[PDB]
A paper describes a structure:
Nucleocytoplasmic protein O-GlcNAcylation is a dynamic modification catalysed by O-GlcNAc transferase (OGT) and reversed by O-GlcNAc hydrolase (OGA), whose activities are regulated through largely unknown O-GlcNAc-dependent feedback mechanisms. OGA is a homodimeric, multi-domain enzyme containing a catalytic core and a pseudo-histone acetyltransferase (pHAT) domain. Here, we show that the eukaryotic OGA pHAT domain forms catalytically incompetent, symmetric homodimers, projecting a partially conserved putative peptide-binding site. In solution, OGA exist as flexible multi-domain dimers, but catalytic core-pHAT linker interactions restrict pHAT positional range.
A construct was designed that lacks the large, disordered loop (residues 397–535) while retaining the pHAT domains. As with TaOGA, this hOGA construct was expressed and purified from E. coli, imaged by cryo-EM, and processed using CryoSPARC. Both 2D and 3D classifications showed particle classes with well-defined catalytic and stalk domains, but none of these included fully defined pHAT domains. Instead, these domains appeared as blurred density in 2D and as an elongated asymmetric density between the two stalk domains in 3D, suggesting that the pHAT domains adopt a range of different angular positions relative to the catalytic core. To further explore this heterogeneity, particles were sub-classified to enrich for more populated conformations. This analysis yielded four major conformations—termed I, II, III and IV—each separately subjected to 3D reconstruction and refined to global resolutions ranging from 3.3 Å to 4.0 Å. An AlphaFold3 model of hOGA was used to guide model building, and across all conformations the catalytic core consistently displayed a near two-fold symmetry, forming two glycoside hydrolase active sites composed of the catalytic domain of one monomer and the stalk domain of the other. In all four conformations of hOGA, the cryo-EM density maps reveal a discontinuity in the region following Leu701, corresponding to the linker connecting the catalytic core and the pHAT domains. This linker (LFFQPPPLTPTSKVY) is of medium length and proline-rich, characteristics known to disrupt secondary structures and enhance conformational flexibility. In contrast, our hOGA cryo-EM structures containing the pHAT domains reveal defined, albeit at lower resolution, density for both regions, suggesting that the presence of the pHAT domains stabilises these otherwise flexible regions. Unlike the crystal structures of hOGA without pHAT domains, all four conformations display additional density in the active site. Superimposing a crystal structure of hOGA with GlcNAc in the active site suggests a density compatible with GlcNAc, presumably co-purified with the enzyme from E. coli lysates.
Author numbering:
A (entry chain A): 59 to 339, 370 to 398, 551 to 593, 601 to 696
B (entry chain B): 59 to 341, 372 to 393, 550 to 593, 601 to 700
The structure:
């Protein structure tokens, strides 16, 4: 039993039920088998957890679970009470029991309770009754696990769910020691990696946290998570994770972008990565570039379902789009090539000599060709017939077009200003000082590398 | 008489029909009377305008027109033929006639021809039949206008509508002379301003346009439109417009933000500019500050069901996202305080450093006010208003917290190391993506020769 699926786990704009039914269709085509419902800004889930659903909310949740059971996807209703809860008071425990009982009647078999992004200080009665935070949380998890008759897949996310959040280490922390000692063995734990956003989840960190919890954890994976930076978007493949982590784990649950239609690659490459191996003890039987190419090919076929009726987008346009928006700690090959060409062009911009003028103007012409490629990419993407995918990522491609036009203008200005032929950079483009709207001003007034 | 209303005329995701009915309810509540439907990223309006409506969206447009007529708002179905239109081809004119005629059979009574961003001239036989491009546009506008038997309100938007678009000057341009002579009266024109964002439309620019168009223009407002960057919104007043423009104009149409729920303040302050100030003809009196206070009071009344949001939070929110050019008083105060502190940064922790610490204490207090504004706005009952503007308040929250940590490092500059915090966020994990990196590498005023 392996829990390979998608956790909705971001902040702000939760998905709609039609999007989740399309997600359940998408997982069943890709042989994935789980879905963890935990949207942080759904107000019946986090900010108010004592409040019960209405009749229409129960109906849409009931048909959501029915669509999941139709599509062989294990719906896991999670619930995060940790912002305001008295664990010592049994009234909050019984209210949580009532809420989990009402969601039991909607057809849910798998459940979870989540304790994330909360301060480590407790109440006065919680400090009076119980010794530490982890003892109270593991007593709540054991009480809910006994109250629901020990479900087959129950998930528990700790407050120190990554390597930076736990102190002093992953092994000397008293929190993970209490969690590993006092927990029932059928309850799977959640984990993220060395950070909240992990560049890599190495094998040895998984093995030492499997020592400290005495179980194989399920990695909540915020690789393509979009909630911390809403100016960014990630369309890279499922990289940074070795294929030998599958026998050392109980599940991989990816937390994708806040926009649903930008998540074809981020779930399909996870499906290809899970299809690499399933058992047995720079990567063997998995290439992230080949999984990225397969994801973009199937996504181009998704684009071609309405095609052009009611130029079209090509595969090279999608590859440029994925290379422009790749990873929280990486860019694409084309994006890094454009970065190093612009850094070269602004290096010797002030003094350019002969053969030096020849190579400068040739690489400036190559940069203008790449700028025309991104203009053609945006124009062919805006002429597509799948309108929902266009509306989900219109701000990002609009922002990269509106930046790259002025970058193309400044490279044309530098081509003018290599020789003494008057002009000004102000006369080429107006030097605006209001990008971001008092956020980019503070961002540019803050130091970078 | 006067066409004071809202043009839904941006790039991005167009609004759904139910929030358009909510918009019609708000326009009925604020004594506005117009709505210019022209969403530029719609696959039936701008591109593929020749395609007839389907058998499931025709009833949606019919119910939208009937909901407009219920609240006594003039639905103006604009159409943008200017992508691949052949003006001299009569079959294209017949397809345009059938397309407008099927909206005329949907109950729509006002129509508009829109010619934005088509300033490229005609070609082959199209360019030689007509003497100028404007002659072709006013001839097909007169043909459509007499085909419909002269409707009461018809709007012709040229491509030379911006003051910098008209070449040369305003009066010396041949386009505005051809439009002002060879177009029939009763077809009112659309004029944005001396700029495309229109910081200040004065009386004299309106006189210089009205002497060449021989009528009064209905003024387009991109004063709160965020379709050019989509990284900020605008909650400011209707600043930059004299009260005496109402007898010299035929209408004012406001293009608001692409997020619908952030448009309460801008449309309401337009309403307090019009219906509370000089409805009559009078050939300074409107206070933008009191209009902003009234708009924020009514928006606070919208915000109720209880997340305890106060009016100081909304004044702070409107000051954080204020105008395309200006900022709020509190936002400019925070920016000038932060640049004073980063200019007068203490080497170690007499007179200078004490005043520095006092201003740093006030700065961290108002940063905590920003945090309180976000955490009270996240607890509001009406979730859709939160979901529309979540990215902007999240961005300003995270940027304000990093700026507060940088001020905390600046208070102990000799003691602490690795700048603000070494937490693998020195590029803020490449904030903005490639758009942010190329924007920071653009020489606005830092590397400006």
């Amino acid at each position: 039993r392996f829990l390979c699926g998608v956790v909705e786990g971001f902040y702000g704009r939760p998905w709609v039920m039609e999007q989740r039914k399309e997600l359940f269709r998408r997982l069943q085509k890709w042989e994935l088998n789980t879905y963890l419902y935990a949207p942080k800004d759904d107000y019946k889930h986090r900010m108010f957890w004592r409040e019960m659903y209405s009749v229409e909310e129960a109906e849409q949740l009931m048909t959501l679970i029915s669509a999941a059971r139709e599509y062989e996807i294990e719906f896991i209703y999670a619930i995060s009470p940790g912002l305001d809860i008295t664990f010592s008071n049994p009234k909050e425990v019984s209210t949580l029991k009532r809420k989990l009982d009402q969601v039991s009647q909607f057809g849910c078999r798998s459940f979870a309770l989540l304790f994330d992004d909360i301060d480590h200080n407790m109440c006065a009665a919680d400090k009076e009754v119980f010794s530490s935070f982890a003892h109270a949380q593991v007593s709540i998890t054991n009480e809910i696990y006994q109250y629901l008759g020990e479900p087959e897949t129950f998930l528990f996310c700790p407050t120190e769910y990554c390597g930076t959040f736990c102190y002093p280490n992953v092994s000397q922390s008293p929190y993970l020691r209490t969690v590993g000692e006092k927990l029932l063995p059928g309850i799977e734990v959640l984990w993220t990696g060395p950070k909240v956003v992990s560049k890599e989840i190495p094998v040895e960190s998984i093995e030492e946290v499997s020592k400290i919890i005495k179980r194989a954890p399920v990695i909540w994976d915020n690789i393509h998570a979009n909630d911390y930076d809403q100016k960014r978007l990630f369309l890279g493949p499922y990289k940074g994770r070795s294929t030998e982590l599958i026998p050392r784990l109980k599940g991989v649950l990816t937390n994708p972008n806040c926009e649903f239609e930008a998540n074809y690659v981020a779930i399909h490459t996870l499906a290809t990565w899970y299809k690499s191996n399933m058992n047995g003890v720079t990567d063997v039987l998995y290439s992230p570039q080949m999984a990225l190419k397969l994801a973009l090919t199937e996504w181009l076929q998704e684009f071609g379902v309405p095609h052009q009726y009611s130029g079209s987008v090509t595969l090279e346009d999608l590859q440029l789009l994925a290379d422009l928006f790749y990873l929280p700690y990486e860019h694409g090959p084309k994006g890094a090539q454009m970065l190093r060409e612009f850094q070269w062009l602004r290096a010797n911009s002030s003094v350019v000599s002969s053969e030096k003028i020849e190579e400068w103007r040739s690489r400036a012409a190559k940069f203008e060709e790449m700028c025309g490629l991104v203009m053609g990419m945006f124009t062919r993407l805006s002429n597509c017939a799948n309108r929902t995918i266009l509306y989900d990522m219109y701000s990002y491609v609009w922002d990269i077009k509106s930046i790259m036009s002025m970058v193309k203008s400044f490279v044309q200005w530098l081509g003018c200003r290599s020789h003494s032929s008057a002009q000004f950079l102000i006369g080429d483009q107006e030097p605006w000082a209001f990008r971001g709207g008092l956020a980019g001003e503070f961002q540019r007034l803050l130091p970078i590398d």
